[PDB]
Amino acid sequence: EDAELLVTVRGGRLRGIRLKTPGGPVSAFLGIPFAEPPMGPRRFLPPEPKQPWSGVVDATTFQSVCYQYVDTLYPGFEGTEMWNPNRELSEDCLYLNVWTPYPRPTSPTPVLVWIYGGGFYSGASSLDVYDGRFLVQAERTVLVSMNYRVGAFGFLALPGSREAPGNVGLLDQRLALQWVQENVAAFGGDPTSVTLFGESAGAASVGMHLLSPPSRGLFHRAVLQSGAPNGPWATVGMGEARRRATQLAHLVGCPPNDTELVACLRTRPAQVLVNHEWHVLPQESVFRFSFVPVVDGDFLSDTPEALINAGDFHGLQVLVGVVKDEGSYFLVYGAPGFSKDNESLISRAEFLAGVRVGVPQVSDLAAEAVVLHYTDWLHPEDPARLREALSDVVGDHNVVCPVAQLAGRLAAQGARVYAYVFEHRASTLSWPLWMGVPHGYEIEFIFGIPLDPSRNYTAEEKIFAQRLMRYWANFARTGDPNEPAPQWPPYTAGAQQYVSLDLRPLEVRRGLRAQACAFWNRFLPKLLSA
Amino acid sequence: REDAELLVTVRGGRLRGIRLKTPGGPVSAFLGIPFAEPPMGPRRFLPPEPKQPWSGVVDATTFQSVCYQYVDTLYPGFEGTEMWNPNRELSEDCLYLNVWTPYPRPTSPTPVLVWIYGGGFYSGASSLDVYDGRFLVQAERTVLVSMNYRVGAFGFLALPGSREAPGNVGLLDQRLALQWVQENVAAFGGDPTSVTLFGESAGAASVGMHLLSPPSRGLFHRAVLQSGAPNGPWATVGMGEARRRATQLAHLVGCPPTGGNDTELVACLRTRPAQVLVNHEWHVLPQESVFRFSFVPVVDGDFLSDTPEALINAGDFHGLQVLVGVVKDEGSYFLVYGAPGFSKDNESLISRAEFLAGVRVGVPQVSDLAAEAVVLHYTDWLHPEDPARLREALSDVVGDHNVVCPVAQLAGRLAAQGARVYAYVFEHRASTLSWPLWMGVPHGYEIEFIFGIPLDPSRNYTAEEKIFAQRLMRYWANFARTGDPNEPAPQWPPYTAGAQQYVSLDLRPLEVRRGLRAQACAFWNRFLPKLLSA
């Protein structure tokens, strides 16, 4: 036996596995149970800590994926299948994973905690693009990821009720963070140096832990990639959450009050709920998801926008950023005229129709304001400009401007913020050229996937991945990504400085689409209230 | 004895003129021809009556009085403002017109240019030196007519529905002069079947209203609108707001001893000295502002059967040629009349607080949300507080809202509905300009080049500017003769709703460009009206 892969945590003994890397081995402990399986009567309930066990838990392989919708838009296409579950689906899915260097560190090592995205309806810690072996070998930190409930199982809410309080998927993450505080030292980790990082809904999850006091004490630094808690998609109001929960029950034959409604939902197989998940949305749209965190005064005592404005953020360091073309990926899921298999050169009529699906549940006047700002009135009908304009609409509304607002408010209120735009299109990208650098395609570089010899990244891209891993790990260690070389300056509300990340050296630029984001963050709210 | 070239007979009687000297040769001028009975005493606020025939010879040898009006006092003695102030005595006896014709009189019918001065409908006169018609007539051999029309309350005080003060009588003054041209211009060698209206500022808005009034439309064939349009937010007023302003003016001068019977109210107003009415003219505006004037044309269903925008959108304009344009910096002149932080004597590098305050003065009587939309669009959010950018932004706000975007909307609708449109932007700053450099090419300072003022030997224009003026006079006269400013050489393409082509007018040859501030004017012409409705 290998003593380096035997660990005793508070709940019992674990057996890990030795993983290979072009730079040397790492230790991995995969599929560690941190909660009781939320099954049967425990569906929709907050998680319970895992009860202690006898014997040795086999922690050599990833555990099941939390039950979720499986994408079918392009069957077999690499660009979509890389996000689909690669393990069996189960409601018994509350497991986390620990990667440590080999041999295990004898000194307290900074910890990075990954929260995957997936619009709160999908995702898994077992996806190949989240493989932590290269980060842990290159930068010598402890790396933790957890699975958390998604879709109705994690975020269906009958607000006020005890049978379905909502946000339990977020409590899954918090419980894993508490598990890290109690057990990460047994792997060589330092519980006093924990950096949360996540992408898309994971970034929105990270931001929500920043704004929830019970979570705030479980970590010390935060990285938000292409997501923010204050977007128009990451939260839902109590009334709309209740309406969606009620319509789901109707679509699955329930009831035969909240107590009875939830009891009937608990009798339905997991797939039955998944099969009707998308039909509770109020309208045809993109970048909208059925069951997301709810603002009910508990996990979030107020809206994330209100909490960001009222918060004291001195002593907080955050790393935030976006990719160059945040919106293009979502357009093929419903904007008329868009497809991965052609140039998607849409007409003005399709552009106007696409604005309503990309900015759903918005008055006609506010939609007209969007069309005004995003039309080039010297070329109002040029298909290529319209394709790009609609990508900018979806991307600015949902990612760039929510992130810009978060960064500006945190910086103006005591936090040290570092901002980036990711501008390298991977040579291996399977999405068409017109999508540019699409949403989510900086992750593989952050995790050092180009170092995998089994893949076809260039030598320049391997250098690039090592650069990014160093930035991220420097920030985890010191709150500053810079190597003590062109310097990465902090983002401020006035100067609005960020850096571009690509094969070229760091270049400092001004403004995260300041013109467009003034519209979304300053004017549009004023219009909607009148 | 007498010179036969300076003696002409019109329908009303005989006239005697004068021989003007110009650097290029003699011109015949008939200045101060009465075309209406003096609108004095009981005739104040009433539509004009045609001039009764006279015996003997009327001496049309000098400009007549300026219609009673407010006199600017912002910069006393300053050349930049005094050039617009009355250069003749003020009087309500002011309904006279002027005719310039070549010497000797043309043998064949000659195209006619009719000038309508601006002045915000509260000021102006055809006697101003910058409107001197001798150079145009000499250089291009046209006949030029200009008329005086009543301004201020005397021309546009309206109690709608009352016959005592129906409103728009200043526009009826212009129409009567146009009817006079139809009946009498052939006696001067003019062709009544080739008449081109042209005007600037409120004169351009007047030209546009004649285009949209059927009784006026038959009196001319072509139109030139310089830095003005009838659809601006300042050129017309609703019936109720006209009545509120008229009622408030009478109240401020003691009439009646508020509102009540219209006949008695107007009769009380007619007993007031003309200066007393002028002394309170500016006090009836609903808010402090710039580019807003108290007594302007009223949309009452008569002269204008609807708003100018509705008439423009519903009009068939086939068979019409129009020449429209603006100067490069339309807003700057108006900012020193009330925007906080602005003066001709300093750089006017305003603060953000002064910019935000200026938006409410420059876009008056709109909701807080509408003002926020203006601030969003005209702020550079990468440099939100730089004084120089704020100064230029407020100038653009006032210029786009009041001139550029109204002109662009008119041009686009006319072109899309059968008219042929030629558009320009005037971009030359005169070497003799007295306004400070930060105002650029200000509103109104293309007029002197179109009238050929640089050819005046007493003035100090460069040789290039004299060539420039001669080129502009040729464009205008070519349009008057043929409906096309091009020489029968860089070509001036028509303006269309799609291509939106216009030319730059300056010392360089013609350069073709696209879009009259297309991005800005989409906000003013497409979005903002939808916001005001909700």
Ligand SMILES: *[C@@H]1O[C@H](CO[C@@H]2O[C@@H](C)[C@@H](O)[C@@H](O)[C@@H]2O)[C@@H](O[C@@H]2O[C@H](CO)[C@@H](O)[C@H](O)[C@H]2NC(C)=O)[C@H](O)[C@H]1NC(C)=O
């Ligand atoms: C680009 O393609 C989209 C989607 O078409 C799909 O992909 C093609 C490669 C082919 O497999 C089609 O059969 C697919 O439907 C086009 O948008 C569609 O247009 C058709 C009419 O041709 C219409 O019936 C569908 O409803 C449209 N789909 C959507 C989602 O709006 C689009 O027109 C193409 N762009 C071009 C040709 O410029």
Ligand SMILES: *[C@@H]1O[C@H](CO[C@@H]2O[C@@H](C)[C@@H](O)[C@@H](O)[C@@H]2O)[C@@H](O[C@@H]2O[C@H](CO)[C@@H](O)[C@H](O)[C@H]2NC(C)=O)[C@H](O)[C@H]1NC(C)=O
């Ligand atoms: C509004 O008043 C006019 C004028 O009233 C006349 O003049 C006043 C000074 C006073 O002397 C009144 O007694 C006068 O009647 C009215 O128009 C007059 O109406 C009467 C009866 O027809 C008569 O004097 C003449 O017809 C009109 N004289 C005018 C026009 O000078 C008018 O009817 C009143 N309108 C209303 C709605 O009351």
Ligand SMILES: *[C@@H]1O[C@H](CO[C@@H]2O[C@@H](C)[C@@H](O)[C@@H](O)[C@@H]2O)[C@@H](O[C@@H]2O[C@H](CO)[C@@H](O)[C@H](O)[C@H]2NC(C)=O)[C@H](O)[C@H]1NC(C)=O
């Ligand atoms: C620029 O000037 C304006 C106007 O001031 C006038 O013009 C100056 C050149 C000088 O001749 C002054 O004596 C004149 O009064 C300034 O705006 C005024 O500022 C004063 C003092 O702060 C204030 O009382 C007035 O209300 C202001 N007037 C307006 C219309 O706003 C402005 O401050 C000057 N800007 C500078 C000096 O940077």
Ligand SMILES: *[C@@H]1O[C@H](CO)[C@@H](O)[C@H](O)[C@H]1NC(C)=O
């Ligand atoms: C919910 O409804 C059931 C059936 O009507 C009833 O028996 C039960 O008491 C209710 N529970 C609550 C908490 O209201």
Ligand SMILES: *[C@@H]1O[C@H](CO)[C@@H](O)[C@H](O)[C@H]1NC(C)=O
């Ligand atoms: C032109 O300049 C001369 C001096 O060179 C001056 O005497 C004359 O008054 C000026 N004419 C103007 C300003 O019209």
